[model samples]
Target chain A: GLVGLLVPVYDNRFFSSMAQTFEGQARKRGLSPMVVSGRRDPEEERRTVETLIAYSIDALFIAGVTDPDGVHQVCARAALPHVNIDLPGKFASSVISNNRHGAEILTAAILAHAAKGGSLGPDDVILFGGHDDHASRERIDGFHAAKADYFGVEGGDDIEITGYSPHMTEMAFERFFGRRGRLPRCFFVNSSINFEGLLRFMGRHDGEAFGDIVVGCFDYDPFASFLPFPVYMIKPDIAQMLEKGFELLEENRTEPEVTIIEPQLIPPRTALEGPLDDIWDPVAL
Target chain B: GLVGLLVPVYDNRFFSSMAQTFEGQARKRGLSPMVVSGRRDPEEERRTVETLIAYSIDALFIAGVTDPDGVHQVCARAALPHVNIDLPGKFASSVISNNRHGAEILTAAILAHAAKGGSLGPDDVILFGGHDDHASRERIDGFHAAKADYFGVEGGDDIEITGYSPHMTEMAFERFFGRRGRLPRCFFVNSSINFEGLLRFMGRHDGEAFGDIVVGCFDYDPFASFLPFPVYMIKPDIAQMLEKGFELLEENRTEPEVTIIEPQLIPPRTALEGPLDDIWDP
Candidate 1:
């Protein structure tokens, strides 16, 4: 029984984490897993699926597809049993992050940490990333919603959707850093990809320069716990996310279904250990 | 034809980098690449190979194998043409790092940078890591040789290999940190795995706790370039490493030939952009 997993890319451990989890859980049920990448494109998604037909993938688990609706149809042609994840799709039973809700708490936590230092404002804050194919819009609104719920901080910068890759965030933060001539009092980063850009800007200055600021990332990486700034993180439950997808496929329902799992908030502790390695573990919380 | 790449783990991007490079190069040559993980064990290598043959891999590229000879034999059993890499095997043409040479110069850079501040010694310095299977012993000597060559300083820490994993490194760092009560004056970090543990230990205390020390890691991850510490990085050129491996296989040579590629050094300049977003690019 060969199953397929199509990740956007194995860039960071993020997608690879899900792929590994899918592989692990898939193995538990005695299915051989063939994980591949869609390379974050719709055309690649189609071509990869088209090529995958030869390997005879019984099912495909796709994460963060660039064009979900069209991809749904391409898989239709393969007559492949598929599940959409991370980003939701119309044509298949899917499992995805509660992106808005996660960002809501994520932003709330970062603002809570930042407010302890002092008052925050538009100039003192920024939402610095764009599309996770679909999650960014909902994730960005979660930031906006959180800004208000944080004692209704007015004019606290309009939420942004500039670009999602590190370059976009790097340039966004570059503009923000250069325009402000100082560090933002706080930042609500889109994902770990964006956080790399944030780190680059932070690194451009003295390490001590960011002691007072706070960063809230919608996604989590093990490395985030140790940075100079107090980083607030929300980790999508990848194992649970994939597990839910597996169950959906097992159910074998013809109609599409969607399940949303809440992202867990990870405390930003300087003394933190284990969690770094925990993220790397094939068996994760 | 399907080409297979076996790596130790994807815990960090180190192995992933090579896999992606191999995939890219293979795609350019009009070959389909199917990369798999050995999960840092020999048993998985054997089983993974046994399973891969049914899917019909044209050739396999194996790296960081825990048991190169046995894996070579396993591939032999599969009748799969394979080339050994990174940690070499006796049975195949192999491509590997000049681990000693890279570490030698890497330690020298650490010393030169560390000396810009003041004096150094055994207590004041550390070479934290493991063997490259073979590279570890060579790498350890490279550090020791650099230490010896540094106007011959006395009581220098000879390279120590407690373990190569983050967990082992963390265990050592816990004991070492509590004993020293401060960061070591200068360091030649051996691997990205070891370096992660160092970051864990470094992350435990105040950010100011590590402003003075120097770090040199033999492997490179983009994140290291932006860390608060003055990090010296040697990025193993995966593209060239894999390209050479592919060439070795295409030569269809009978006698086992080994090629060593120099790991390129990278500067620790904290900039607004952390190198290219290899995350997307990879």
Candidate 2:
């Protein structure tokens, strides 16, 4: 019987999906999968990894952060096949979204929406919210790269980029409103949970009612679309992530594919008013 | 020093805000606060209440859920002053948004937006997605009451009102689509998280783009604002929730005061031609 150990780094919705998807795929392959989660701590991670390894599991899938360096040390001590699922770490096999392409697509969607009706102004702003995480950093870089390509310019302060941990609320929209009294004319949201905070801020201030900013979110949420709001979201291909994990586990699979999911574009009716009139409205209230 | 506790029953973005707001208020008062989150577990909730009671905290403020019965048991056992911060349970001192009124306000906003714009069809459908909880049930009932008033009908099922778990991905639009392969003409989303999920689902299917489903979400999200989408969001005044919490702790406030948060009407902007005509056409 094929058996694998699944480690959930944090007991959250996002990581749970990763584990569930992996487990679903494992079960389809006639593999018996067991999932174990640990507190977001290094010591606990070490113990969890050792415990999973002790079960003599064929492969291990770890999601979230822990003592990765220590886990690497322990995995090295016992020649076990393990892979990192969600976030990037020091594991041999890794599965993640193409943050660069997705960010590029998001930026393109916003810019395309901006350019639909008319030309964008020099001072018009597009804000990109991300974090210090590797995926976020890639998104930030992708956003800037897309901006450079669209506006045909080098680095300038015209486009502002901010970072915040989704867990850090005050720091989340504080940075958005802090940068400007009101939300930006357009925004690129890097994290799903952080996007919720941004929406709550709007709900709190009655801002969502009349705002004209274009929002591009990295992750997907269900209710965002119903609001008549324009939010471009990158739906991470969970299927591909699982496929990569299984391929990496199998020894004969060569040149693992770093599959990147493409984001879908959602235009606000305001943006849709003209082909591209207010995509970069300089004087938007 | 004044201390507060934000009992977060669900581990999601909205409750996280309630926790942060409570913490922020506590900080401003020079009070230390702790958040005991259930992350969606009944047993964890029991453990949190017991631990907070043992800590001998100044006051406990719960944001999401409260077993009023549990509150009574704890207060009876520990003699600790506690308040329901957000979702007020019966028999506990609580400061909560009037779920019924908020739902009414949001539904009215959506209907008015549709009515004024002449976008609502006589047979065009509307939906209210709610959580399978007491507070949410109140909001759903409020929605039904509002629907009855608007349509002047007793209970015909012209409007769809359903409940889904807060922990589960809200599938109102999806369920609607499953039933009728198209989005509703308007929607009354019960929570902020539901609004997020609705928006994501719409983006995936092109049905939401040109479709004229006027939306009224019970809660608010920042990204939802920028979409130029119609959203009637009930913005709960945190100040009231906090003030009531403090008042309950100080004055031994026992009776629940369902604080009604005002709802805002977010109008949908159709392309210069006015609200999209033939919203039900396709």
Candidate 3:
């Protein structure tokens, strides 16, 4: 049997990891897998779905979908067993991050780290990056909830929800710096893409010398941990995510059920410790 | 038309970038692209080829092949038009880096930089990582050429050619450090995986503050460019490689010809200058 997977882009760490893990899990189950990227465009995603359908895959795993309903229509017509990952869609069974709870815990970590000679000022911490999808929305809510719990106040000024891209968030950070003229005391970057934007921005200023700034991103990259500063991160349990996703596929149900996997937090410089540690299985196609 | 690409893995920066560029080029030419990773295992590579063949792809692009002749045999039985990338094999046309020359240029950069407040002693530089393949062999040749041109001495004591992996290279470095009780004056890591080994090894001893230790690596990663010290790199012009590869695919020929594209060199921390400045193109 063949399984098909469509992702927004593979140029980033998270999506590439997912594509690789998807193929590996499929192979482990005695199935063939073909993976494709959509460049994060809705039309490209639709076209990729058509290509996978033409490839006659036994099932489809759509991750980072741009337009869930549109992609779901193609799978529905083919009567394909479509399972979503990373992001949730009302059109199919999905295995995603417990974004809200994860972000809440991530926020707690950020605030605590900030208190320990980090950034504790209300104006110093900001939630940056991501779009209005369930992942982003839920995460944003959790970030707000944590702030309210700790600060005894609530509002959205300390957060920015935008399209997840290095370029977009680069400009977003540019505007942010232009307005504030300083780096955030601490930034809970929504994902690795946003972190790249932050990296590019800080790297360009080279002289900014972000002394003790701390970051807790919702994604992980080996190099991010290797940076000159503290960069705690979230490593989505893709292996568990896939295991549960495959379990869902094994069960027959038309009503879409969403499964949430708790992501693990990786402290700074885990790379130096010689491998991130069973963070996931030996992953890839 | 649908095209297929099989690589060792997509978990790394280099191959993932290659996979992304491959798909983009295929889409640009109005063709559907399907990609699979073989986990760098020969049996897995053969299995992936079978899957792509069953998918009825028009052509195949095989990169990082562990057993090229064996994979070529599968493509031959399917009558598939196969092309090779990254590492080369005897069974097909290939568009790969001018490994020897590119590596010579890379070593020259390392030597010059090492001389400038860096390592210049004869025993200081070591060529580390990679294995007994075309890319590694040519690159090893180029490293020797550069060393010969600069120091007028030649031998194999300063080089190590093992598997192209962070873990392998890390242990390789561990053995070297264990023997010599110190780091190389400067390391010319054969590829990113080897660089990983170096990073892990160096990071472990966290107390070994290498002041002004310059490195020249054969591959680039955004994070590598972001490392605390200078990390000069070679960004194999993957875009141009793909273009030349597709052009070769269009030229209808039974005989295999190798096309070599000169790669571009990136100075340490090009990320700070805002996007590495079109060394090739935007």
Question: How many angstroms is the interface RMSD of candidate 2?
Answer: 19.2
Pairs that clash in candidate 1: A130-A163, B131-B136, B132-B136
- TM per candidate comes to 0.89, 0.56, 0.91
Docking class of 3: acceptable
Rank candidates, lDDT, best first.
3, 1, 2
Question: Which model is ahead, 1 or 3, in terms of TM-score?
Answer: 3
Interface RMSD of each: 6.5, 19.2, 6.7
Tens digits of lDDT, candidate 2, B1-282: 425354432224445445445645665575645444432334445555665565455666766653455655775578776776666666666677777777776777778877765656435536555445666777777777777788777455544444333222235556767877766676676666555445445545654444466777765544444454565566666656776677567784445555544434444321111111221010
**Model 1 bad stretches (over 4 Å):** A151-157, A200-212, A269-285, B151-157, B202-208, B269-282
Candidate 3 lands at a TM-score of 0.91
The worst-scoring run of ten residues by lDDT in candidate 2 chain A lies at A271-280
Cα lDDT tens digits for candidate 1, A136-217: 8888878778777765565655555556567666667667667666657877888777777776666556544443678888
- lDDT score of residue A139 within candidate 1: 86
Model 3, residue A212: what's the lDDT? 64
- Top candidate by lDDT: 3
